[PDB]
Amino acid sequence: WTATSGSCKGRCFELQEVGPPDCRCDNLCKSYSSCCHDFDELCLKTARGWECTKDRCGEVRNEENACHCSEDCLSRGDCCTNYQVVCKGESHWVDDDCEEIKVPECPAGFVRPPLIIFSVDGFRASYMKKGSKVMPNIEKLRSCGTHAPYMRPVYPTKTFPNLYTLATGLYPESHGIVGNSMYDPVFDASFHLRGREKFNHRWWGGQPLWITATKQGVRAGTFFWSVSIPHERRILTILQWLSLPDNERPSVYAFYSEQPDFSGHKYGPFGPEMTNPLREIDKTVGQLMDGLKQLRLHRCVNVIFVGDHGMEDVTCDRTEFLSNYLTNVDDITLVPGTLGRIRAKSINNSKYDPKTIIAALTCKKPDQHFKPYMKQHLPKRLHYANNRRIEDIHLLVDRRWHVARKPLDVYKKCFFQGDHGFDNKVNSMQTVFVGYGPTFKYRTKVPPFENIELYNVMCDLLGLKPAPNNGTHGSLNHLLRTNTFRPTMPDEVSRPNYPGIMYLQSEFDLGCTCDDKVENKLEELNKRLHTKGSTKERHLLYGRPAVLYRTSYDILYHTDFESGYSEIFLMPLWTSYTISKQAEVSSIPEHLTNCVRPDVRVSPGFSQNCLAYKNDKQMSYGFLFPPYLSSSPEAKYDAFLVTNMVPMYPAFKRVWAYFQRVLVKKYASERNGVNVISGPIFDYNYDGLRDTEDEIKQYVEGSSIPVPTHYYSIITSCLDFTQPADKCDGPLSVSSFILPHRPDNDESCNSSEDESKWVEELMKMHTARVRDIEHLTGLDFYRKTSRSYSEILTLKTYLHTYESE
Numbered sequence: 001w002t003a004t005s006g007s008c009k010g011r012c013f014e015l016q017e018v019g020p021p022d023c024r025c026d027n028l029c030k031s032y033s034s035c036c037h038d039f040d041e042l043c044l045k046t047a048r049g050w051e052c053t054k055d056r057c058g059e060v061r062n063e064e065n066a067c068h069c070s071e072d073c074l075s076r077g078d079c080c081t082n083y084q085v086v087c088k089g090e091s092h093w094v095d096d097d098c099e100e101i102k103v104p105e106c107p108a109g110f111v112r113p114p115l116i117i118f119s120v121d122g123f124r125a126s127y128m129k130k131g132s133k134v135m136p137n138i139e140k141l142r143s144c145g146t147h148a149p150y151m152r153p154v155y156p157t158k159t160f161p162n163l164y165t166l167a168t169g170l171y172p173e174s175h176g177i178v179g180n181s182m183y184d185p186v187f188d189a190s191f192h193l194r195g196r197e198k199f200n201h202r203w204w205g206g207q208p209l210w211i212t213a214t215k216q217g218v219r220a221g222t223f224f225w226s227v228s229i230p231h232e233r234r235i236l237t238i239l240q241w242l243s244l245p246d247n248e249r250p251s252v253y254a255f256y257s258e259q260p261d262f263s264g265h266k267y268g269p270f271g272p273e274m275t276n277p278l279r280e281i282d283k284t285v286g287q288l289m290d291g292l293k294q295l296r297l298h299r300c301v302n303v304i305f306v307g308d309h310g311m312e313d314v315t316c317d318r319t320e321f322l323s324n325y326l327t328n329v330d331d332i333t334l335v336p337g338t339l340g341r342i343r344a345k346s347i348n349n350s351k352y353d354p355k356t357i358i359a360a361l362t363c364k365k366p367d368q369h370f371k372p373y374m375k376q377h378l379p380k381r382l383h384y385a386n387n388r389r390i391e392d393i394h395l396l397v398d399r400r401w402h403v404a405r406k407p408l409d410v411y412k413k414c415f416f417q418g419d420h421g422f423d424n425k426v427n428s429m430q431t432v433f434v435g436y437g438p439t440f441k442y443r444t445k446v447p448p449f450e451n452i453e454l455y456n457v458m459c460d461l462l463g464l465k466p467a468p469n470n471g472t473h474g475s476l477n478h479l480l481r482t483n484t485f486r487p488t489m490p491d492e493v494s495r496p497n498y499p500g501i502m503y504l505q506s507e508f509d510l511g512c513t514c515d516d517k518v519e520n521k522l523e524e525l526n527k528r529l530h531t532k533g534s535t536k537e538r539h540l541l542y543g544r545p546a547v548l549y550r551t552s553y554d555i556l557y558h559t560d561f562e563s564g565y566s567e568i569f570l571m572p573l574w575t576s577y578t579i580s581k582q583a584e585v586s587s588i589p590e591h592l593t594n595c596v597r598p599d600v601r602v603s604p605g606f607s608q609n610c611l612a613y614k615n616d617k618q619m620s621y622g623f624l625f626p627p628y629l630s631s632s633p634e635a636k637y638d639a640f641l642v643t644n645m646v647p648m649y650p651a652f653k654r655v656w657a658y659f660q661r662v663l664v665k666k667y668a669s670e671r672n673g674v675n676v677i678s679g680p681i682f683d684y685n686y687d688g689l690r691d692t693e694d695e696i697k698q699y700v701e702g703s704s705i706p707v708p709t710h711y712y713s714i715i716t717s718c719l720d721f722t723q724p725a726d727k728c729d730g731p732l733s734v735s736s737f738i739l740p741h742r743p744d745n746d747e748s749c750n751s752s753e754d755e756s757k758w759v760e761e762l763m764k765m766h767t768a769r770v771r772d773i774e775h776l777t778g779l780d781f782y783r784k785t786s787r788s789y790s791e792i793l794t795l796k797t798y799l800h801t802y803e804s805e
């Protein structure tokens with residue numbers, strides 16, 4: 001109940017929420033149906049529209065008007081935004097030459113440059129170029145400030161998950177807004193875009209920027225605008241708040257536009273109808289900048305122009321129906337559209353079986369336009385699994401398509417032409433970022449980056465300590481003129497042992513065999529030097545990775561590779577090797593096919609054994625440093641050490657062997673050498689974080705050899721590819737992957753074909769950031785380079801996307 005009979009007189013767009021059933025005059029009052037009786041009258045004035053005209057200049061103040069053109073309006077802070085242009089001979093902000101903002105030029109009483117986040121829904125990255133002729137204000141922000149060619153949203157590429165990621169720096173699995181629609185089985189409650197459940201605080205995890213600010217004594221304006229408040233009134237309200245006394249004035253503000261998303265759904269991303277919405281958003285930017293200029297704030301405020309996601313062509317003829325695949329379609333609930341989430345319709349149904357649903361959905365139609373996954377098998381870069389609101393069965397839908405349960409769902413609900421929500425690496429889903437103001441750089445292009453990084457930067461712009469989040473703080477320092485965050489590298493927690501030769505061959509009873517009994521002072525000294533690390537500078541190019549947790553491990557040196565060998569997991573945490581452009585690929589010689597060799601530096605008790613693999617009918621093994629890339633027949637024996645072996649399903653060995661035999665040399669050829677670091681990952685609870693020993697769900701049968709859930713590789717070379725990877729003077733280039741370690745290749749519908757037709761496609765799907773691998777391994781890479789630490793942080797956040805221009 002609301003007692004709507006109090007008044008909004010002197011309270012319009014009050015910042016503090018007054019407590020029920022007392023009536024409200026704040027922004028949110030419309031959303032809750034709790035506004036005082038006179039809110040529309042007092043707070044939503046529209047009389048005489050939004051612009052001054054010549055006949056209005058110097059008018060007698062009429063308090064009924066939407067905005068004012070009277071002499072007193074500047075001191076009241078309520079002029080129409082074009083007042084000084086029409087009435088005082090000034091120029092529009094957009095018509096002014098841009099001039100570098102070297103220092104904040106703020107009025108007396110301003111403690112810090114305010115931050116205004118101007119958010120636009122469905123603003124596809126390519127609109128910045130394709131719409132530039134119709135968006136002069138935005139084009140001026142972009143060209144004169146700091147801009148990225150695009151900014152990568154989070155998955156799913158929907159509004160609430162992305163706006164709340166902007167607000168928190170968190171992945172949706174961590175902040176809890178995992179879709180625009182959700183069911184939480186613990187609350188037994190459903191979240192929808194329409195309705196009131198979505199305002200309940202239990203949905204919204206983490207700590208959003210406005211709360212971060214308020215806790216640290218920095219006042220915030222509204223972030224969520226009620227849909228019925230016109231954009232012109234949102235801008236006027238922000239300008240009015242900026243005219244408050246110092247002690248009352250917020251330092252952080254947001255604007256939001258539901259365009260161009262609203263029209264893009266109706267017309268498609270490039271429908272001719274889309275020009276007008278882009279012109280209108282540009283006009284709104286112009287109102288804000290004209291308004292700031294009138295207040296003498298246009299060289300004081302930092303403005304961020306940012307989108308939540310892009311927009312793709314999607315029409316309802318491009319819909320896959322689950323009723324064409326499942327016999328039992330009535331026993332499931334599907335969250336449909338540009339992603340699919342499946343759960344049992346009834347928890348009482350003991351005939352429900354996820355395995356049979358996945359199988360019925362796997363590679364059943366030649367041109368099938370979605371792929372089913374158990375959520376733990378989704379690409380790790382999506383970070384889309386560790387939340388009870390994410391159903392165990394997920395459908396990744398091809399760009400331009402929908403999935404639905406039955407055809408009747410599509411016509412009893414072919415109107416729309418645009419949608420979004422797809423995989424966040426898809427080009428059409430990318431969105432925009434521009435920063436303009438004293439704290440941003442001048443006329444500066446920065447590489448694409450992820451929206452999870454922005455919360456830290458917004459905290460830096462406001463002098464706030466960010467709450468714990470998924471950004472990598474410092475990775476966006478290159479966007480900023482000042483206020484940079486200068487992180488220190490994390491301290492190494494575990495120091496390595498450097499074992500020498502400590503065991504005789506006969507101490508091992510591993511069930512392994514090798515035809516290596518093939519028997520020189522010249523070259524005996526050489527082999528000893530290699531085992532002490534004489535080639536390490538060639539193979540460990542950026543320092544050894546640091547281990548950031550407590551464990552027991554050994555550094556092992558070899559002619560062709562170096563490794564950090566875990567005595568706890570019985571395999572390397574990492575193996576590092578450099579392959580020059582000139583490297584030759586060779587075969588595994590016949591006499592060495594089944595060769596595994598005890599490592600006389602590592603105790604039998606801390607080694608794998610061959611008998612376990614013989615007995616485990618499901619599990620085979622592979623090698624981290626590839627025997628195919630040995631530098632000589634003699635060095636090749638090192639590759640068959642038991643300390644270089646890792647457990648691999650035979651189906652996965654198809655993938656790994658093709659990567660090692662074909663792809664590494666291809667990349668060395670293309671990139672002028674590569675340095676490779678490879679290793680296992682254990683993430684059985686799919687939280688994106690390194691498992692401890694007691695979290696491991698599967699072992700090689702009868703042994704203590706843990707089975708990895710994934711294998712990673714980090715492939716680094718010189719950004720200037722005229723220099724070889726091992727003699728690089730300047731910035732680095734990286735690409736990485738985290739491949740799922742699966743006992744079948746059901747994910748790859750073409751896997752019956754030669755690996756040349758499917759393996760690299762799989763690897764591209766599972767592309768990763770170095771930072772993703774760091775979370776999953778507790779390792780810290782690139783500790784010893786010539787490069788600045790913030791440059792290295794940017795490198796560690798890079799994702800090689802494999803999308804065209």
Ligand SMILES: *[C@@H]1O[C@H](CO)[C@@H](O[C@@H]2O[C@H](CO)[C@@H](O[C@@H]3O[C@H](CO[C@H]4O[C@H](CO)[C@@H](O)[C@H](O[C@H]5O[C@H](CO)[C@@H](O)[C@H](O)[C@@H]5O[C@H]5O[C@H](CO)[C@@H](O)[C@H](O)[C@@H]5O)[C@@H]4O)[C@@H](O)[C@H](O[C@H]4O[C@H](CO)[C@@H](O)[C@H](O)[C@@H]4O[C@H]4O[C@H](CO)[C@@H](O)[C@H](O)[C@@H]4O)[C@@H]3O)[C@H](O)[C@H]2NC(C)=O)[C@H](O)[C@H]1NC(C)=O
Nearest residue numbers: 173174175176204205206386387388468469470687688775
């Ligand atoms: C991205 O960045 C984020 C932010 O840094 C990273 O997430 C953090 O990861 C930590 C490790 O997973 C996690 O730390 C745990 O916190 C527990 C207390 O958490 C509450 O308090 C915080 C602080 O305010 C709050 O933020 C949390 O919010 C979560 O929970 C509510 C739901 O109740 C949601 O509204 C909210 O969205 C968020 O949910 C997300 O996180 C939880 C995990 O907390 C997931 O379950 C959800 O699915 C969702 O993703 C909480 O309200 C604390 O209790 C934990 O301590 C246990 O583990 C330690 C290990 O040291 C152990 O020593 C303790 O004994 C304890 O174990 C006991 O409990 C076990 C479980 O019941 C039990 O089995 C044992 O036997 C023991 O009894 C732990 O320290 C931290 O909370 C989150 N923070 C956030 C915001 O998510 C994230 O990892 C980053 N991602 C990547 C890939 O890098």
Ligand SMILES: Cc1cc(OCc2n[nH]c(=O)n2C)c(-c2cccc(C(=O)N3CCOCC3)c2)cc1Cl
Nearest residue numbers: 117119163164166167198199223224225226254256
């Ligand atoms: C720039 C920016 C704009 C935002 O919303 C702009 C908006 N205005 N109107 C409208 O439809 N949208 C989408 C939000 C946001 C979005 C959704 C939810 C919340 C939130 O945290 N809420 C609201 C519900 O109640 C719970 C708390 C905040 C976050 C940021 Cl960073």
Ligand SMILES: [Ca+2]
Nearest residue numbers: 121122159308
């Ligand atoms: Ca949106």
Ligand SMILES: [Ca+2]
Nearest residue numbers: 683689690691
């Ligand atoms: Ca884990």
Ligand code: NA
Nearest residue numbers: 613616619620
């Ligand atoms: Na086996």
Ligand code: NA
Nearest residue numbers: 745746748751
């Ligand atoms: Na297959």
Ligand SMILES: [Zn+2]
Nearest residue numbers: 122261265420
């Ligand atoms: Zn939309």
